[PDB]
Symmetry: none
Subunit: 408 residues, 3 copies
């Protein structure tokens, strides 16, 4: 099993070098260094016991946080989320809008607070310093990843924006990549309340950033030379409301994507008959397309069908859909069994922003800051989505590597 995953790594990086603009002029120190850091964090939080403990403790912490969040919701929306629902609607009583989305809100608030007091800025400074020192990468991109872990896509530019101006091509592509692989606080919390394993998610962010910069450099190394809230309360407020527009954005976007995909399965299911298939879903199709990719990453075939199914069902669409069909396999009243290693690899791989929509999310949101580069950015959009994708897939592979411990 070990050499299978090692193989996986080799394959991914291979794909990278293939698609990479410049196959040479890759500084090995920077790259394999970053990589080594990635697998290092993986082994650290996963393999050795102290890792499992500290990680679990993290889960304890922000699960308490989230619990505060649902205290909030329990206040705002009242008993509509209470334990009485399950005695009624049962397995349908879980309201994805009233429960999940508000955590997006709350976290947007909290994260805004953490800008304000300066905690985020502090840690970003630290980890950024770590990256710039160990690899030798430019300051702004390291910092960019650093925040990209911890904060939303709207509050991410707060640090990066002044640097973007004279930013090189590599640096920019690193901003994009790190932005694609990483997941915001808000969406993360959402992922929690959806039922998705937390510890793995944490691991997935902390892997996401360095992997982000890893493929960001691999694809396109650098040629040329490098270079408001009043009081806390207000910060909390602006964070909340910003979180509101974000919330509605997500929720609506999801209803859309789901219903559309349903329609598409209506039609494809239809033409299946012309070709002689009574029933077919888009899911299964993607499951055919990305299955091999699911084999490379180390997942056993029998479950790799569904693995590739879900990965593909992320990339071409988005994450929340994917997880929302994952929890069907998670909640154990079903008969469909999924191996531990499978649950892991999927859990990581589906953690990321990488999709088709995220391109325009970025190009658009980055336009108001430095519109001069809008063309270039749009040009690097797809390759960047590839970067983020490869990052999350690598992380997933690192998961698959470590069998020492078992999932929930």
């Amino acid at each position: 099993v070990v050499l299978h995953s090692l193989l996986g790594m080799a394959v991914l990086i291979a794909i990278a070098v293939l698609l990479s603009t410049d196959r040479k002029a890759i500084n090995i120190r920077t790259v394999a260094g970053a990589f080594l850091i990635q697998v290092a964090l993986g082994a650290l939080v996963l393999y050795v016991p102290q890792g499992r403990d500290m990680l679990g403790e993290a889960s304890k912490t922000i699960s308490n946080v989230i619990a505060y969040g649902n205290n909030g919701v329990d206040f705002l929306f009242g008993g509509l989320v209470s334990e009485k629902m399950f005695e009624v609607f049962g397995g349908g009583g879980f309201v994805f809008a009233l429960r999940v989305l508000p955590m997006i809100v709350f976290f947007s608030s909290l994260m805004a607070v953490l800008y304000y007091i300066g905690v985020m800025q502090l840690l970003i400074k630290v980890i950024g310093g770590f990256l710039q020192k160990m690899l030798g990468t430019s300051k702004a991109e390291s910092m960019s990843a650093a925040a990209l872990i911890f904060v939303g896509q709207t509050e991410a530019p707060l640090v990066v924006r002044p640097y973007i101006r004279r930013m090189t091509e590599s640096e920019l592509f690193a901003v994009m990549s790190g932005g694609l692989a990483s997941v915001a606080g808000s969406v993360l919390a959402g992922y929690v309340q959806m039922g998705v394993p937390l510890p793995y998610l944490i691991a997935a962010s902390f892997m996401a950033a360095p992997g982000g910069l890893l493929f960001a450099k691999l694809l396109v190394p650098e040629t040329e030379r490098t270079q408001k809230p009043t009081n806390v309360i207000d910060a909390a407020a602006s964070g909340a409301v910003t979180g509101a527009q974000i919330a509605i954005a997500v929720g609506a976007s999801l209803l859309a994507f789901v219903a559309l995909i349903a329609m598409i399965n209506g039609i494809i299911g239809g033409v299946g008959g012309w070709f002689g298939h009574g029933d077919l879903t888009l899911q299964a199709i993607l499951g055919w397309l990305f299955s091999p990719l699911a084999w490379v990453i180390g997942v056993p075939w029998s479950e790799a069908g569904i693995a590739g199914s879900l990965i593909g069902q992320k990339v071409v669409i988005n994450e929340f859909v994917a997880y929302s069909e994952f929890v069907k396999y998670l909640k154990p009243e079903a008969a469909v069994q999924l191996s531990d290693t499978t649950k892991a690899i999927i859990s990581f791989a589906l953690c990321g922003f990488a999709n088709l929509g995220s391109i325009a999310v970025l190009v658009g949101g980055l336009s108001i800051m430095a519109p001069k580069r809008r063309k270039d950015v749009a040009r690097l959009g797809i390759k960047a989505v590839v970067a983020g994708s490869l990052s999350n897939l690598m992380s997933a592979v690192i998961a698959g590597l470590f069998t020492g411990l078992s999932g929930a």
Copy 2:
């Protein structure tokens, strides 16, 4: 025999309130009427097409409820009824998201290129036969396919300098049309879907009619407009968002006006309190106000007052609340001809809140045009209403 006279009376009234008696093309208006009624029989009297189409978009709506059942889960499931009752039908959750969906759906269809095609075809047709401006045709097309809120998203290039006519045409045309929101909401309410599809096709060109009656055209049109959806997914997303927040707006507005009119019930009861008459209701006042016209459309004096309150509420409140009180008058008087008549009469979303919308957004795309749009709202309601009424009497004709 009462029908024809009725139609004549409607067109009469419209003219009576119309600005210009010029209307240099009567072939356009009478021809339009001709198109309305012709298609009316075409989907009714003569024989495949309509059945398959109707059930098709029926399945579409089912996709919608799959989306919602995802997002809002149990709350929109059927258990509510065993819990609450018919009062357990939750509008906000059940309906507005459909707006989100149909919106997204458009954007997708625009990116793949279907709506350009459909609207090009139908638009080309109408403007060819009845010989008018193309814009109104376009909007009308979308108004067959989608509803009032989603419609304006196409006409943004042509809105600037709309020659004040095309503008009113889109206004009214929207107001009468049923697709998306009002359509889905209707289906969920349970009123038969295919009859409503027929109502949709029947609603659009009628708008063209009455609009062309009130405010004809002069000035040049075609050339106009001297951020992009990028790929397909982003199109779906962006569309979803825009539609969504539009839906929020819609809901808010609805609650607003409904509430205000209730406030007016309080006003009437208040004044009439010391007037000694007392307990006089807007339901009753409009009940006797639109009653004569309710007689005009061919519905007998028997069961007229019903249409008085219902239509009244359609003008001021909406056709929804009016539909609720309608089905309240259904199961005990209601005559079948008056049933169908008041039914399609109850079809169309045109109201105060409706023009509130299509003034608001349409304004947002044309700020210098704002005063000019908002100035026409009520008369527009008149137009679209009378359109659905033409549709109504026509429904009476095949009864």
Copy 3:
């Protein structure tokens, strides 16, 4: 039945004001003692003397009926989810703050849009503003503002100040600011109602707030400069207006919506955060040996004197302290949220009628630490050059409005101490 303690309260408050004030001398006693006297005058008018009490009744039931029209609107929109059946099922948790309240915010927003458009508000405003400007020594503008802040808060733009603010004097500016921070907009008032908070007390709060606003305004930073009034305006482009009554109802409604969402999200955030902090202090306190400690009790322990001063008896001073504290350091809504749970008999703690009154007034206003940034942000758009001077005055402003409410409360303690 001595209730001299009350006068002592008025004394301490006004005292703190004067002390904190910038220019001692410049205070014009006619203006300040005037405003104060109007505040207490109304205090007696709507409480002690039965006539105004009756009037207050009429108004109460009136807007209560308006509110009923609101709930009918809701009952259409969100349907049976707010119907009675929830209680038979979801019980005491069946009361859904997102469903029960925020819509009323929207509705009143549309209403007040209609009442600007038709012109009722403009007229009433011009009356009250006329009154205050003629009697005591305020300028035209600040008076009209303080008038309109009873009926409409900075939620919807006051827009009587639009020509005036740009190039307006320090004391005047601080008078608008404090004015706003003193009162409650209509919509949020409705919210306060549906939460169960007593209505008439709130009405009295809205009316008492303005003159008190001017009280502490002119106390803290008196008028050192030259008023303008009818002299020179050069107003802009007939503003930007609603077209007809309809588009009014709309703009006001939708505005009411994004306001609703704003409030909802904000409260989610705030409640949860406070729970979090309660976690931290809970733990640390657990190390010092206090297992049970919260932001609340700390605040009550901090604001207790202010509690005893305003006429609240000591026993209840802890609670009044915690509440008013949450008014100042967080916002008013949260405060009420913890408050109403003391208004139902099913709840353990009982509060003396006088105390209920007093607190119920004191928490009425936008005075908090967020409304500074809100003001600055909304105010700058009208007058960009002014922003600096504004932010300079934000804090002193919050103090002002806060104290204004406090005076109001004291008054209530006295007169409801009598009539009851």
